[PDB]
């Protein structure tokens, strides 16, 4: 926690000369307003004005005027005078928070969750990213930074070792890193965080993306969170380990049952499974995202839960006690953390307050099953394209309730425009398959 | 020996900021989990969790959850804040060691050996490696770092001397180096270690491979332990000098016989010769390995033992006293040290407890002998391909007992898949010989 006096003291002792008022849009892009430190007081008075329509992304029409209200607890100084940042909420000219701000939407969802008796919603993300080599002109190529495998000690200590530098710099900034390892695909890396509250977790995800992209550029590399940059290799996921708490106590832990899961946890996973098609578009917002949702690369392709399976939509880790959690594995690093977390929490709460019955967990004898038999058993498939994902999202009420009307409509319009632009392109695959056979 | 307090003191005084929890899979690849030093306590409590299925290599199916238990005696700090490492055993969620971990398998084999009255199994390896030049893009080429010969003083003193730097860095790390020399083939090098106990010897082999690969990259070179990188020149071997000890005393030494070999040593070498075809696949796990097992390059090609021969499978060095040992020369540096050592020890113990009679040693009049006469005498040939090596391994019970059912089955599946992928390739040799003659 910080106050105005703490911020002034930090600016004075650390010789901060630049301030970044940081926020996000509906597409998850990290936006910021740059300010000289001489404006610090005006920053602390919630008097900084900006367009505000930039939150709409590429579907903005008219310039508005909106105020930035910094959150003093998000204060941090970058290790590169010095530059400091503050994460700010967006307010309208009438003093009320802007309904199109994902952070405010997540805060509203958490506040409405608190009326159900729960106090905290903790998230631990597992973001995976790719590192590509840069060419002479400074553009990213398709060559990977290394050639390691799953949990390999591929980047040696002598040389670049971008992952180690990223971890150390995040530790210096005040982050809580659990562990890091090399991912399955060459040039793919994963850094894991300790669990934190929802808003703090999403802020940490945004800051982690920014820090990774900066440090990769320091090492003459390019960091990408693209869900599927390369065909034929593993994609990048952002698995969300979530846990509910109502007062110094995990609501998912059952200390008496051998399995160790309460009825609340079963209702939560049932609700997430019920509305999985509804929030797939939000959790997988890019056209490329659905190139990751293909079988054989551990990404989930159908709606099921298990404790031990190759690619379940929901996985329950063997940890118990205060660390019991539910892992949603459909999220990719390109998704907006606030919107995806709000959608997942809303689906879980919808399952909780409807007392839904969780279906049977899947086991090893599902690998031999076509889609027809899978549907006969009751296992629905995730949408395979962004078009069908938007079609499914337009038919779900829980996702609309989670997002709010403004964010829901803007996201649908943006994604429809993006798909419309994508669908008219003639791909090289078509020119290879056709143009000689026809 | 080290304790928790020693580790904390070392971290505090040396300013260790990064920890590598190091382990290995069934393919011998050095795997690791990276951790910030702030997690040190959680590391020392055996509470670090990871996939565990990575031990299976490329035949893993479902993600598991397994714990890492570090061995405090393996603590060492790399000379490149600082980075430290700890070699960890893999434990299941039920508190028992994972049966698929090669290190635990070797420990179990040693424990069962201790019931026969023997206390220690000392190993001294002779790993050989190649150094290739890197191109502008940083990829390895086929040009060697020097053009020296057997025991040559090729990289004299000034400019790279990669072997000297490797030896000095290993000495600074606390290793025990006996001697180093240039190998027969150009760009080929060998570094010899003093004998150590089995687990320590295999850990030293893994650390040596990691250190060599790091330092070669430091010198703009590429170090490879591939058994036969180049056709027409010598391959790289990892000859194992092994010795048995039952209490401050070498069990292979006979102080009265002028040969100086105990009947126990003869039984051990008889057992190793008997099951040589059984463990050839484990000691030579790559397809390329059997390109080294060709006549004319000192690699063993048939099953025989001698005290003076060009390429015997087992060699008995002239040293006696406490340093008498048996050298198995079929092992290559690409083999997993734990699995190969366990297989060799199990074969030796099988010979010991069956009181097998060692065949007559071979001498100079075997060079003029075809395979028919060699088989008539009683000299069997080693498997010539990985396919036939797997066929022979499937017919040996000693190798299965040495490896354990889990490791045996996973290794067989992995190698069968690898051979199946290799056999469908059309080689450049086939395109050179055919396509014009047919």
């Amino acid at each position: 926690t910080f106050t105005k006096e703490d911020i002034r003291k930090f600016a004075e002792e650390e010789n901060v000369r630049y301030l970044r008022l940081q926020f996000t849009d509906i597409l998850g892009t990290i936006k910021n307003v740059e300010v000289p430190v001489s404006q610090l007081e005006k920053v602390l008075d919630n008097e900084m004005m900006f367009d505000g329509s930039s939150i709409e992304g590429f579907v903005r029409i008219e310039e508005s005027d909106m105020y930035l209200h910094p959150d003093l607890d998000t204060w941090v100084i970058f290790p590169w005078g010095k530059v400091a940042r503050l994460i700010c909420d967006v307010y309208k000219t009438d003093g009320t928070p802007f309904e199109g701000d994902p952070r405010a939407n997540l805060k509203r969802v958490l506040k409405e969750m608190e009326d159900l008796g729960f106090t905290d919603f903790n998230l631990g993300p597992e973001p995976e990213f790719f590192l590509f080599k840069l060419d002479e002109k400074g553009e990213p190529t398709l060559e990977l930074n290394d050639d390691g495998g799953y949990f390999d000690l591929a980047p040696t200590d002598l040389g670049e070792n971008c992952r180690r530098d990223i971890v150390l710099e995040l530790e210096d900034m005040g982050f809580d890193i659990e562990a890091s390892h090399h991912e399955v695909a060459p040039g793919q890396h994963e850094i894991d965080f300790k669990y934190a509250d929802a808003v703090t977790a999403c802020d940490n995800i945004q800051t982690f993306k920014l820090v990774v992209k900066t440090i990769a550029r320091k090492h003459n590399l390019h960091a990408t969170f693209m869900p599927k940059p390369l065909f034929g290799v593993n994609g990048s996921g952002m698995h969300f380990n979530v846990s509910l708490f109502k007062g110094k106590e995990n609501a998912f832990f059952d200390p008496n049952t051998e399995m160790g899961l309460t009825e609340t946890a079963y209702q939560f996973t049932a609700g997430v499974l019920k509305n999985a098609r509804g929030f797939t578009a939000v959790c997988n917002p890019l056209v490329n995202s659905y190139k990751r949702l293909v079988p054989g690369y551990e990404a989930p392709c159908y709606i099921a839960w298990s404790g031990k399976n190759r690619s379940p939509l929901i996985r329950v880790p063997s940890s118990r006690g205060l660390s019991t959690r539910i892992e949603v594995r459909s999220v990719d690093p390109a998704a907006n953390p606030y919107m995806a977390l709000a959608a997942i929490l809303e689906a879980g709460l919808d399952g909780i307050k409807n007392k839904l019955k969780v279906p049977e967990p899947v086991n090893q004898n599902i690998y031999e099953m076509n889609r027809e038999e899978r549907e006969a058993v009751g296992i629905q498939d995730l949408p395979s394209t962004l078009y069908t994902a938007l079609k499914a999202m337009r038919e779900n009420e829980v996702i609309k309730k989670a997002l709010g009307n403004h964010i829901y409509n803007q996201f649908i319009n943006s994604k429809s425009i993006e798909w419309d632009y994508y669908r008219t392109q003639v791909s090289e695959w078509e020119r290879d398959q056709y143009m000689k056979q026809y | 020996t080290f304790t928790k307090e020693d580790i904390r003191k070392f971290a505090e005084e040396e300013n260790v900021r990064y920890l590598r929890l190091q382990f290995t899979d069934i393919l011998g690849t050095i795997k690791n989990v990276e951790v910030p030093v702030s997690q040190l306590e959680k590391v020392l409590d055996n509470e670090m969790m990871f996939d565990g299925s990575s031990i299976e290599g490329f035949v893993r199916i479902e993600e598991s959850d397994m714990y890492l238990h570090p061995d405090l005696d393996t603590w060492v700090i790399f000379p490149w804040g600082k980075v430290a490492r700890l070699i960890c055993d893999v434990y299941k969620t039920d508190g028992t060691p994972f049966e698929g971990d090669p290190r635990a398998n070797l420990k179990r084999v040693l424990k069962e050996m201790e019931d026969l009255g023997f206390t220690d199994f000392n190993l001294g390896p002779e790993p050989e490696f190649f150094l290739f030049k890197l191109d502008e893009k940083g990829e390895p080429t086929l040009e060697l770092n020097d053009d020296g010969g057997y025991f040559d003083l090729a990289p004299t003193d000034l400019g790279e001397n990669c072997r000297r730097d490797i030896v000095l860095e290993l000495e600074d790390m606390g290793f025990d180096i006996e001697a180093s020399h240039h190998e027969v083939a150009p760009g080929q090098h060998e570094i010899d270690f003093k004998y150590a106990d089995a687990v320590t010897a295999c850990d030293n082999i893994q650390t040596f491979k990691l250190v060599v690969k790091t330092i070669a990259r430091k010198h703009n070179l590429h170090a490879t332990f591939m058994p036969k990188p180049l056709f027409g020149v010598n391959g790289s071997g990892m000859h194992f000098n092994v010795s048995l000890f039952k209490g401050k005393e070498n069990a292979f030494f006979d102080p009265n016989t002028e040969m100086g070999l105990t009947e126990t040593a003869y039984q051990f070498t008889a057992g190793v010769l008997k099951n040589a075809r059984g463990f050839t696949a484990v000691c030579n796990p790559l397809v390329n390995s059997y390109k080294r097992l060709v006549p004319g390059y000192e690699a063993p090609c048939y099953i025989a033992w001698s005290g003076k021969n060009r390429s015997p499978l087992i060699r008995v060095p002239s040293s006696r006293g406490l340093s008498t040992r048996i050298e198995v020369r079929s092992v290559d540096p690409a083999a997993n040290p734990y699995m190969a050592l366990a297989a060799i020890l199990e074969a030796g113990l099988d010979g010991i407890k069956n009181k097998l009679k060692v065949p007559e040693p071979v001498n100079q009049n075997i060079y003029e002998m075809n395979r028919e006469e060699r088989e008539a005498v009683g000299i069997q040939d080693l498997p010539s391909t990985l396919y036939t090596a797997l066929k022979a391994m499937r017919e040996n019970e000693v190798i299965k007992k040495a490896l354990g059912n889990h490791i045996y089955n996973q290794f067989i599946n992995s190698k069968s898949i690898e051979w199946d992928y290799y056999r469908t390739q059309v080689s450049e040799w086939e395109r050179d010989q055919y396509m014009k003659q047919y």
């Binding site: 495998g149 399955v184 695909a185 290799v233 593993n234 551990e298 | 490329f58 035949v59 199916i61 898949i417």
Partner: peptide, 11 residues
């Protein structure tokens, strides 16, 4: 193959 992602080295 079920584990296509783990066999990417061979393909």
């Amino acid at each position: 193959p079920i584990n296509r992602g783990d066999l990417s080295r061979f393909i």
